[PDB]
Every structure is written in structure tokens, then in C-alpha cells.
Structure 1
Amino acid sequence: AAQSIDQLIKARGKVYFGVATDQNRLTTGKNAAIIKADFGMVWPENSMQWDATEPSQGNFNFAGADYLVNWAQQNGKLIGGGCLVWHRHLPSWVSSITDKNTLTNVMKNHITTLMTRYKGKIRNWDVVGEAFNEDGSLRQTVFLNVIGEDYIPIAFQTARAADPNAKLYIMDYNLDSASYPKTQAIVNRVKQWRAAGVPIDGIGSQTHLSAGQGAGVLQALPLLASAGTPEVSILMLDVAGASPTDYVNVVNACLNVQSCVGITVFGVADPDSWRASTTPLLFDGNFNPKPAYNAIVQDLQQ
């Protein structure tokens, strides 16, 4: 039987090798079996996003998120949650809010309700996602436009109050190159926020790579770590082509960075990827471990 990359990465001092999933993955294919055997943390693919959890103001949908949380607890898995404040999965009703006080309270209520429901059960909460433009300026989302840049500090202070046990993360993508301005920009702003006591515990890099981009993460992840958060993480990892070299490079970036607590892949098997044509995950369409998985196993040998 294949070795567990979660157990192997733990044996090297890390916290987890995780995977995104949800109810209908756990009831189909071989996902439940693979997650039970080989992964140590689960994230909700969709079921904790805003459009899934608060489809109208103050009215929440927790059946799907509850299923995942329960399954994780039944199978001794750590749980990540998110994203609490993210423009991409925002219902239209949030986008129409124009009053600063209203959106602030709406955003706080969304954060507090989700985090309170799972209080003490969630290791990591991704509180703010994709807040940056590619040039490193702040993305002009409804939260920035209506609340202003204080929405990020407010989001994290609210999260800390709701569940002090959780590690609070900001996440973004295209943080994979140390020379890309987005990567330095998130570092700059997180240093500034943490100097102001904002409880940003982690930076999570949503790592969607093209073939050959794994090597650059060996420099970009330490740069993210230079922001001084207690933790950084690789999130939503997938790699077009799934070359062993790309994946092992990302893993060794994690191993190289003392503050990097672990890695989360963006699904179990290729056909369930949002870019399945690029066969970018660690298991194929027959749920067989791919060369990249075996290479991670060998790279993590002690």
C-alpha cells in the first residue's frame, strides 16, 4: 500500500499534508479512502465560501460545511476553513451594499457566525482572500471600495475574537515568484499589519502552477515567510502536468521554510480538478497515485 505523505511530512516536523474536499467527494470515487489514508487535514472546497454559507443576509447554510466538519472529526483529520472574506464567491447581495457601517457589520457577522459555529474545531481559518491586485495594490472589491483598507484589520480582529484558538490566514495567488510585485506587496502589507498588532497568523499561497514553476517557490515561499507571520502555508496546490520535479520543489520549499506548517493540494484526483485537462493533481482518473505522489513519498523519506 502507498505511504502516507501526511504521516511522512509530520515525521519531518511539519503539521499536515492536506486536501480540499466536500460531501459529494467523500461519498464518491475513492476520495474518502485516500484522504483517510494519506492526508491529515481537510479543507472545504466550496461549502464554507460566502455564496455557499450566507446566500441571503444573515441567513446561513451549514449543511454542507457541517458534513465536512463532522467527517473530519470522525476520521481524526485537522480542518481548515475559508474563505471568510473573498470577492470571488460573494453573493450579489453583498456586492450591492454601499454603506460602510452596514458592510462592516455584515462582514463581521459573516466571520463571527462561521467561526463561532466551529469554534475550537478549526485549525486554520483563511479570513481574507485575494485582496491584492497583481501590481501589489489592494484589490478594489466591495470591501475595499465601501469599507476601505481597514476591512482587513477589522476582519482579522473579528476572527481572533470569534475563535482565539484558530490560526488566522490571509491568502492569495500568484505569490509563486519572489520577483513578482504581488509577492513583495503582500509581504510589505502583512508586516505593517502585524506591526499594528493585527492578528495575521499566516500567509497562505494559493499555488496554481504551470509546468516548471515549482522551482520558483523555493524563493517565493521564504519571501512570504519574511513577513514574520508565525506560519505560512501552501494552499490549493495544483501543477499543470503534475511533474514530480515541480511537486517535489514545492514540498522542499515547505521543508526549507521553518514557519511553513504544511501543504494543501486542491483535490484528490485529476478529473475533479477545476483544470482537469492539465492533470494537475497527485492521483489520476482511476485514483491511482501518480509519479508526483511517489516522488513526494521518496522526497519525504527520512
Structure 2
Amino acid sequence: ASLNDLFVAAGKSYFGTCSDQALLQNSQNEAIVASQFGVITPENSMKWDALEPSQGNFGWSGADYLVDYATQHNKKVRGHTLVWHSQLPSWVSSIGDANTLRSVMTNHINEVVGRYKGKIMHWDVVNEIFNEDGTFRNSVFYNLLGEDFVRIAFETARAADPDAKLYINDYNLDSASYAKTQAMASYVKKWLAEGVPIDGIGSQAHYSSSHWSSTEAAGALSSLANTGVSEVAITELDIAGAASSDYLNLLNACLNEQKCVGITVWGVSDKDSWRASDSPLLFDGNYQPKDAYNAIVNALS
């Protein structure tokens, strides 16, 4: 069985994973990427610290490797991520002047989106811009440019590649009534009305061992769709303990929301996860399917 083939047959666009050059060069891991996942997100190689480590000096090797792998394998890519406070080079947060940041951020987006024009399915244009209480994270982008950094970023990405679906991505959007989820919905609805070219909301869905119940996932995802945004996606799913019933709850959150295009799980093998000790993925440390894998296959079969 193939997760991607099954989910596409069920009417969705893709079932995806993350990867990058070293992992794609591992023959056990690569065989699973090839057979199971229709979309790949670069785990690190398209982050700003990798792509533009000093101003105007871009480095493309890792990101190019992943895009070329996907092209060759007839897979699509979620470009990740253009504007984010984390894994950002210190030269960017040292900028003291709004107009300088506007130029720097516009240039970063224009060059990255432009290089990969026509080769990228989704871009995570802005990432993790909200605090838990629904206010804007006081990053260099928000502190110097205000809420307008979002509109500038999306406008820039749209112009550089009109065919990529442009996403805002965040974590802890797992409960409809939570302040952060409500803020995301509120702001996206407003920005849509203002003409900001946002095509999608991405919900990362990093479920800890003391999280909101996965019974809330369906309503949370629908609340994001109900903004009027054209599509939503579950973008970085992993679940402490990987209980089949939790993974099925997330599967069904997507299946039961017309606007959800797909699910990405955040890696292949537990051993390669940021959270390996919590065994949170669909394959074990010897690249063998786990119970949640089999449950998803049964549910789609």
C-alpha cells in the first residue's frame, strides 16, 4: 500500500513528509519516500539561514538537491519557509531600520520564490507569526514593519511565482476556541477582505503528550477553512506515542473538511524525528510501519 496513492484515491491531493539531502541519500529512508509520499517539505534547506547566510549571498545546494529529487520522482514540494523568526541569520535581526528590512525581506522572497518558479506547490510564506494569546510575535519583522510585513511578504511571493499556493503556517491551531486559532482565523479573514493573496492556512499539528485532545482537530481545521481561505493543510503532523486513534482523528479532520488538500507527517522514521523519544511518526527506528500506519491504510482501504 501507499499512503499517498490511497489518500489521492480518497479525493485528496497528497499525503506528504519532510526530508532533505542526507535523508534522501539513505537508501532505506529513500525507498519509503519514493513509495509512500507524494509531497516533500525540506526539513531545513529552504530556511533563511541556509539560503541567505549573508546579505545578498545565496546558497542553494541543499534546496536544489531536494527540488531535483522531487522533480525526478514526480513529487511536489512545500517550500518552507520564507519569513520566520527562528533559524534566521543574525544579520537580519540586527537590521535597525524599517525600510532596510522591507528591502531585505522583499529581496529574500523574490530571489527564493523566483529561483524555484513553477516548481513549488505551496510556499510557507510566513511561519509562526502568532503568540499563544493571539498577539503578533515580536520578531524583527513585526517590530519594524508591523502587521504590514505579512501583506508585503505575500504580495512579493505572489508576483515572483503566481502558480504557487501561498500559505501562512503555525502550530497550536489544534482547538477552535483557543486564542491563537481564533486570531489566525480573524486575521486571515481580514487580510482576504483587504486583497492579501493568501491561498492557504497550514496547521502544523505537533501533538505533545499533554495536548488538546485530537477530538478537537476536526473543528479546529474547519474553523481555519471557515475564514473563506481557498484551502487548508495539515503541514507538520506528529503525535506523541503515535496512537492509531489519534492519527485517525487527524486523518478524518482532513477528510471531513472539503478545503483540506492533504496531510504532511513530519518525517518518516521515529529515529530521525526532533521528538524521537516520543515515537511520534508512522515508521519505527528500523523503517517498519507502525500500528498507526496500518490503521490509516485500513481506514482508506
- Unaligned 5+ residue runs, structure 2? none
Paired with 1:106 and 1:31, the residues of 2 have a C-alpha distance of: 37
Residues 18-37 of structure 1 show CA distances to partners (whole Å, capped at 9, x for unaligned) of 10000000111512100110
Identity of aligned residues (%): 61
Cα distance, 1:299 vs. partner? 1.1
The aligned counterpart of 1:146 is 144
Instruction: Report what 1:12 is aligned to.
Output: 10
The 10-residue stretch of structure 1 (48-57 or 25-34) with the greater mean CA deviation from structure 2: 25-34
Distance in structure 1 (CA, Å) of the matches to 2:258 and 2:220: 14
The AA in structure 2 aligned to 1:34 is I
Q: Which structure 2 residues correspond to residues 1-302 of structure 1 after superposition, within 5 A?
A: 3-28=1-26, 30-211=28-209, 213-301=213-301
Report the Cα distance in structure 2 between the residues aligned to 1:31 and 1:158, rounded to whole angstroms: 35
Alpha-carbon distance in 2 for matches of 1:33, 1:214: 30
Post-superposition Cα deviations, 1:261-302, rounded to whole Å, max 9, x if no partner, equal 00111100001000100000000000000000111111112x
Deviations 1:34-55 (A, max 9, x none): 0110110011000000011110
TM-score when normalising by structure 2: 0.98
Partners of 2:36 and 2:21 in 1: CA distance: 18
Deviation at 1:89, TM superposition (A): 1.3
For the residues of structure 1 that align with 2:267 and 2:6, how far apart are their CA atoms?
A: 19
2:189 is paired with a residue whose SS is helix
Number of equivalences: 299
- Partner Cα separation in structure 2 for residue 31 and residue 175 of structure 1: 30
The residue identity in structure 1 corresponding to 2:156 is: T
CA distance in 2, matches of 1:243, 1:61: 40
3-state DSSP class of the match of 1:200?
Answer: coil
Aligned to 1:137, the other structure's residue is in SS state coil
Any idea what the Cα deviations from partners look like across 1:58-96, whole Å, max 9, x if unmatched? 111100000000000000101110110000111101000
Q: Secondary structure at the residue paired with 1:93?
A: helix
Deviation at 1:228, TM superposition (A): 1.1
The alignment yields a C-alpha RMSD, in angstroms, of 0.9
Mapped partners of 1:282, 1:215: distance in 2: 19
Distance 1:31 1:199 in 2: 36
